[PDB]
Enzyme design. Structure first.
Site, PDB file in Angstrom:
ATOM      1  N   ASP A 218       4.918  11.200 -10.947  1.00  0.00           N
ATOM      2  CA  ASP A 218       4.265  10.638  -9.769  1.00  0.00           C
ATOM      3  C   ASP A 218       4.589   9.158  -9.523  1.00  0.00           C
ATOM      4  O   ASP A 218       4.597   8.709  -8.391  1.00  0.00           O
ATOM      5  CB  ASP A 218       2.766  10.850  -9.861  1.00  0.00           C
ATOM      6  CG  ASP A 218       2.159  10.343 -11.190  1.00  0.00           C
ATOM      7  OD1 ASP A 218       2.867   9.775 -12.052  1.00  0.00           O
ATOM      8  OD2 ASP A 218       0.938  10.533 -11.348  1.00  0.00           O
TER       9      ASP A 218
ATOM     10  N   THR B   9      -1.669   7.708  -8.786  1.00  0.00           N
ATOM     11  CA  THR B   9      -1.615   9.122  -9.133  1.00  0.00           C
ATOM     12  C   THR B   9      -1.935  10.060  -7.988  1.00  0.00           C
ATOM     13  O   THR B   9      -1.078  10.821  -7.574  1.00  0.00           O
ATOM     14  CB  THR B   9      -2.530   9.454 -10.305  1.00  0.00           C
ATOM     15  OG1 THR B   9      -2.058   8.687 -11.406  1.00  0.00           O
ATOM     16  CG2 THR B   9      -2.376  10.950 -10.696  1.00  0.00           C
TER      17      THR B   9
ATOM     18  N   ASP C 136       5.223  -0.660  18.496  1.00  0.00           N
ATOM     19  CA  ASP C 136       4.288   0.191  17.784  1.00  0.00           C
ATOM     20  C   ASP C 136       2.944  -0.547  17.734  1.00  0.00           C
ATOM     21  O   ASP C 136       2.509  -0.994  16.685  1.00  0.00           O
ATOM     22  CB  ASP C 136       4.810   0.526  16.386  1.00  0.00           C
ATOM     23  CG  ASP C 136       4.000   1.607  15.711  1.00  0.00           C
ATOM     24  OD1 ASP C 136       3.308   2.387  16.417  1.00  0.00           O
ATOM     25  OD2 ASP C 136       4.056   1.692  14.470  1.00  0.00           O
TER      26      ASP C 136
ATOM     27  N   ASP D 298       1.248   8.485 -18.912  1.00  0.00           N
ATOM     28  CA  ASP D 298       0.434   7.476 -18.213  1.00  0.00           C
ATOM     29  C   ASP D 298      -0.741   6.973 -19.062  1.00  0.00           C
ATOM     30  O   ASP D 298      -0.980   5.782 -19.161  1.00  0.00           O
ATOM     31  CB  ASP D 298      -0.122   8.056 -16.921  1.00  0.00           C
ATOM     32  CG  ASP D 298      -0.938   7.047 -16.109  1.00  0.00           C
ATOM     33  OD1 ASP D 298      -0.376   6.222 -15.374  1.00  0.00           O
ATOM     34  OD2 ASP D 298      -2.160   7.062 -16.174  1.00  0.00           O
TER      35      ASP D 298
END
Ligand SMILES: *[C@@H]1O[C@H](CO)[C@@H](O[C@@H]2O[C@H](CO)[C@@H](O[C@@H]3O[C@H](CO[C@H]4O[C@H](CO[C@H]5O[C@H](CO)[C@@H](O)[C@H](O)[C@@H]5O)[C@@H](O)[C@H](O[C@H]5O[C@H](CO)[C@@H](O)[C@H](O)[C@@H]5O[C@H]5O[C@H](CO)[C@@H](O)[C@H](O)[C@@H]5O)[C@@H]4O)[C@@H](O)[C@H](O[C@H]4O[C@H](CO)[C@@H](O)[C@H](O)[C@@H]4O[C@H]4O[C@H](CO)[C@@H](O)[C@H](O)[C@@H]4O)[C@@H]3O)[C@H](O)[C@H]2NC(C)=O)[C@H](O)[C@H]1NC(C)=O
Ligand code: Y7T
Ligand code: CA
Ligand code: CA
Ligand code: CL
Ligand code: K
Ligand code: NA
Ligand code: ZN
Length: 806
Positions: free
Chosen positions: A305, A156, A684, A258
């Protein structure tokens, strides 16, 4: 302490101590004035007008009003006009195109309302359609995607703060619903007050972007005890404020579906009601806007979300079954795992031994351990001190926990959750929703799936704001909008290439290399020169050469079968480009050429790699970027053994690469009617998702200045209409890419003892990438010369091939 909320209910500016508060977060802080409930959380008579209330004398104790002065006061119940004035609910009106904003006088811009729904899985749009008519109308009349991809972890707080910032969790700092910061020596949790401290929250969220640029913004957070009907009425009241006081951006948040999904699973029969209830709330907002004559003025974003997966207690993997020494660790548990030492600064804790004890220990093991720098680069989940070094990627439908006592709680362990989320953001069940409805969005338009990191730029566009720097690719979502305020343009090339000719005699090189190339015509000699000068270049470089966006020294090298951009600083190509038609044939590396490496007479000995270094480095071998297996002729094959096509490769990685080059490229060309491939190294070493400078490199081939890549990429392009060959495509393009970690073992792949056909492709799919990801990691810019619009190319560069089913 003291004061009153009289005339201050849901005030927009929050007051400092010791004065008491009346804003929409005061409950969270326990700092509301003593009369906040009485004045600001009225409930008398519920939320709906009935016929007998119509025209009532105003009673200030009511939750909302049906009295004649209510429109002017801004506080009618949302159904007032329907019950009391013969008006129709918004949902019952036909879709009519909103060509221009239809706003009351004094509205300087269409307001934006963001309606966010927690745990709203993408497939609810089809599966619950019969019970969500308001949402279904938004979706079909406005602009919608089949799904929107969340960020990882699919929790979330990381996703909603991503929505607000356009930033990866690694950059904004909210890297989980739980986190421990070793610098703060403090923990952030869903529940509790620590999360209120601004020190956790980085980046610049939309409300701050807006305010800094003189656009007023509502709060995006809501106290959990304020019911949804009161959130809606509050937004509708703020929308009736005077022009100079009224916000232009509003956010409504729902904890459903949710909250129920966790109890009942994503499709439990108990889920129909929470969906009906969310729809009803959307109905209230839309009826409310229509009363205020704002329903053809406001832009509405309906956005989730993350989704929700079936997850039960019995599908829990326990670390205590793998480690003997489990009291030495702290685990952040659940649908992901993060492990650090229990005792901070404990010197005799070995991450390498923990990883080893967790690797491929049980045949159907439902998690995989990773050092965070080895996680798929597409997750962008490493560059933050709050992300533990050891990460466990958990299979969908599973949990990880430290010991059984953590899950099965006393008396005798009853379960009581059937749903969870947080898994890898490519997982179908984690996908969520996006609908945009309003004058600035397109009318009845489907758009392809896209990532939530892109929305911030679009919200800024919707509000006339300049976005703070973020991880979206601005222009990639221009196709969502009827009217664009942002015109993307290509970055300027920083370094121009050299085009070297033949400048060195063979005997100038002392590279310790050997090749059997002396073997054995006027007609085929001009043809050779033509090739070295760029004659086949339109075949192998289909979309123009990549632009180099930083300062460096590099050479373009042309060949019959491939072109490259060769870095004199890194001593290897930054990119190698080649096209393989559906008809192309695979051949072997002839016996006499097994260990052939040839000096490149266009490139100085001093800017070349050397075979001796590889001989001396007992860990490190080499491979080639353009594959010798795909040479167009026995003669062109010699070009593939140039020292300028060589790159350092661990023997373990060579197994992956050789299978990709020998088997998979040809299969893709067969399937896609030709492919164009661009391959290269990535460095990287500080795992920040960005191209390393030469002074960041931590490993070289022994006794040389040849740097060792952390990853190798390929971008594989063809025609979207596969009836046209890759090299003669008239329309939009189709792409898939990967960034493979360059690792000295195949521990990541539990089946790697088997033939490559049983594991290599599974590994590549896991390390699928966007073109944009490779761009950040290389400082290159691709697709510079196509016949496609730049906005379309930006969408193409953000595409991720996920390999999920539909
Ligand atoms: C995704 O997008 C984002 C955003 O574009 C990309 O992230 C950016 O990446 C940049 C390069 O890595 C980085 O530049 C740094 O910044 C250093 C200053 O950083 C602080 O200030 C930032 C700006 O704040 C202001 O503006 C914003 C609006 O956006 C407002 O909201 C602010 O309030 C300010 O008005 C600020 O954003 C940044 O935040 C981070 O740190 C916070 C405090 O701890 C956290 O709360 C927050 O969450 C951020 O944390 C992330 O980023 C940091 C790295 O910055 C990272 O460590 C965390 O893990 C986490 O990921 C800060 O508050 C600046 O000092 C740097 O300059 C040094 O290096 C450069 C070249 O690299 C040199 O040219 C320069 O001279 C200097 O060298 C000297 O200093 C060195 C120490 O760093 C030292 O070793 C050396 O010897 C020298 O003395 C550099 O410019 C941005 O900070 C960063 N932004 C964000 C938000 O993360 C990201 O790369 C993209 N990802 C991909 C894959 O593309
Ligand atoms: C960065 C910043 O300015 N602050 C100041 C206020 N701090 C704060 C204060 C009071 C609070 N009261 C209730 N809740 C529950 C809740 C969840 N959600 C979903 C949602 C909504 C928006 C975003 C975003 N962005 C998000 F992350 C989560 N909304 N309310 C909070 O989380 C909360 C947070 C957070 C830090
Ligand atoms: Ca959520
Ligand atoms: Ca880097
Ligand atoms: Cl978490
Ligand atoms: K070697
Ligand atoms: Na293995
Ligand atoms: Zn949840």
């Amino acid at each position: 302490t003291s004061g009153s909320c009289k005339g201050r209910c849901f005030e927009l500016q929050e007051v400092g101590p010791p004065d008491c508060r009346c804003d929409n977060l005061c409950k969270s802080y326990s700092s509301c004035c003593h009369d906040f409930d009485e004045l600001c959380l009225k409930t008398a008579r519920g939320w709906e007008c009935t016929k007998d209330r119509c025209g009532e004398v105003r009673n200030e104790e009511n939750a909302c009003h049906c009295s004649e002065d209510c429109l002017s006061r801004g506080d009618c119940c949302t159904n007032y006009q329907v019950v009391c004035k013969g008006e129709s609910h918004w949902v019952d009106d036909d879709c009519e195109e909103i060509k221009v904003p239809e706003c009351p006088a004094g509205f300087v811009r269409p307001p934006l309302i963001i309606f966010s729904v927690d745990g709203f899985r993408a497939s609810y749009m089809k599966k619950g359609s019969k019970v969500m008519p308001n949402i279904e109308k938004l979706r079909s009349c406005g602009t919608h995607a089949p799904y929107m991809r969340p960020v990882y972890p699919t929790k979330t707080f990381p996703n909603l703060y991503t929505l607000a910032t356009g930033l990866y969790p690694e950059s904004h700092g909210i890297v989980g619903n739980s986190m421990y910061d070793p610098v703060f020596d403090a923990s952030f949790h869903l529940r509790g007050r620590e999360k209120f401290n601004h020190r956790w929250w980085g980046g610049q969220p939309l409300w701050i972007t807006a305010t800094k640029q003189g656009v007023r913004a509502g709060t995006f957070f809501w106290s959990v005890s304020i019911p949804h009907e009161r959130r809606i009425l509050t937004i509708l009241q703020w929308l009736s404020l005077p022009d100079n006081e009224r916000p232009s951006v509003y956010a409504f948040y729902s904890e459903q579906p949710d909250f129920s999904g966790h109890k009942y699973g994503p499709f439990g029969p108990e889920m129909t009601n929470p969906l009906r209830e969310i729809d009803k709330t959307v109905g209230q907002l839309m009826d409310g806007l229509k009363q205020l004559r704002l329903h053809r003025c406001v832009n509405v974003i309906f956005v989730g979300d993350h989704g929700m997966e079936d997850v039960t207690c019995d599908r829990t993997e326990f670390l205590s079954n793998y480690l003997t020494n489990v009291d030495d660790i702290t685990l952040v548990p659940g649908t992901l795992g993060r492990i650090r030492a229990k005792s901070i600064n404990n010197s005799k804790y070995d991450p390498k031994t923990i990883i080893a004890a967790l690797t491929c220990k049980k045949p159907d093991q439902h998690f995989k351990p990773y050092m965070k720098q080895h996680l798929p680069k597409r997750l962008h989940y490493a560059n933050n001190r709050r992300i533990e070094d050891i990460h466990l990627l958990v299979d969908r439908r599973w949990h990880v926990a430290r010991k059984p006592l953590d899950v099965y709680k006393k008396p005798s362990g009853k379960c009581f959750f059937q749903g969870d989320h947080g898994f890898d953001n490519k997982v179908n069940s984690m996908q969520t929703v996006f609908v945009g409805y309003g004058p600035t969005f397109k009318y009845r338009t489907k758009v392809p799936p896209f990532e939530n990191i892109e929305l911030y730029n679009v919200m800024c566009d919707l509000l006339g704001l300049k976005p703070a720097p973020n991880n979206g690719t601005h222009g990639s979502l221009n196709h969502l909008l009827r009217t664009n305020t942002f015109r993307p343009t290509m970055p300027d090339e920083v370094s121009r290439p050299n085009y070297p000719g033949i400048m060195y005699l063979q005997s100038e090189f002392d590279l310790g290399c050997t090749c059997d190339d002396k073997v054995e015509n006027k007609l085929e000699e001009l043809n050779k020169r033509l090739h070295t000068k760029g004659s086949t270049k339109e075949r192998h470089l289909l979309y123009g050469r990549p632009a180099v966006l930083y300062r460096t020294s590099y050479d373009i090298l042309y060949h019959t079968d491939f072109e490259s951009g060769y870095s004199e600083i890194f001593l290897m190509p930054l990119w190698t480009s080649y096209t393989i038609s559906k008809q192309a044939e695979v051949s072997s590396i002839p016996e006499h050429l097994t260990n052939c490496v040839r000096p490149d007479v266009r490139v100085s000995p001093g800017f070349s790699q050397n075979c001796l270094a590889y001989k001396n480095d007992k860990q490190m071998s080499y491979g080639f970027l353009f594959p010798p297996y795909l040479s167009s002729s026995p003669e062109a094959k010699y070009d593939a053994f140039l020292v300028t096509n060589m790159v350092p490769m661990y023997p373990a990685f060579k197994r992956v690469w050789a299978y990709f080059q020998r088997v998979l490229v040809k299969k893709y060309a067969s399937e896609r009617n030709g492919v164009n491939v661009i391959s290269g190294p990535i460095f990287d070493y500080n795992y920040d998702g960005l191209r390393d400078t030469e002074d960041e490199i931590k490993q070289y081939v022994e006794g040389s200045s040849i740097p060792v890549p952390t990853h190798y990429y390929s971008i594989i392009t063809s025609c979207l209409d596969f009836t046209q060959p890759a090299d003669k495509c008239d329309g939009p393009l189709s792409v898939s890419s990967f960034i493979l970690p360059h690792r000295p073992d195949n521990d990541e792949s539990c089946n790697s003892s088997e033939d490559e056909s049983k594991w290599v492709e599974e590994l590549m799919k896991m390390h699928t990438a966007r073109v944009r990801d490779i761009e950040h990691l290389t400082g290159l810019d691709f697709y510079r010369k196509t016949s496609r619009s730049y906005s379309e190319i930006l969408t193409l560069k953000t595409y991720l091939h996920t390999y999920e089913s539909e």
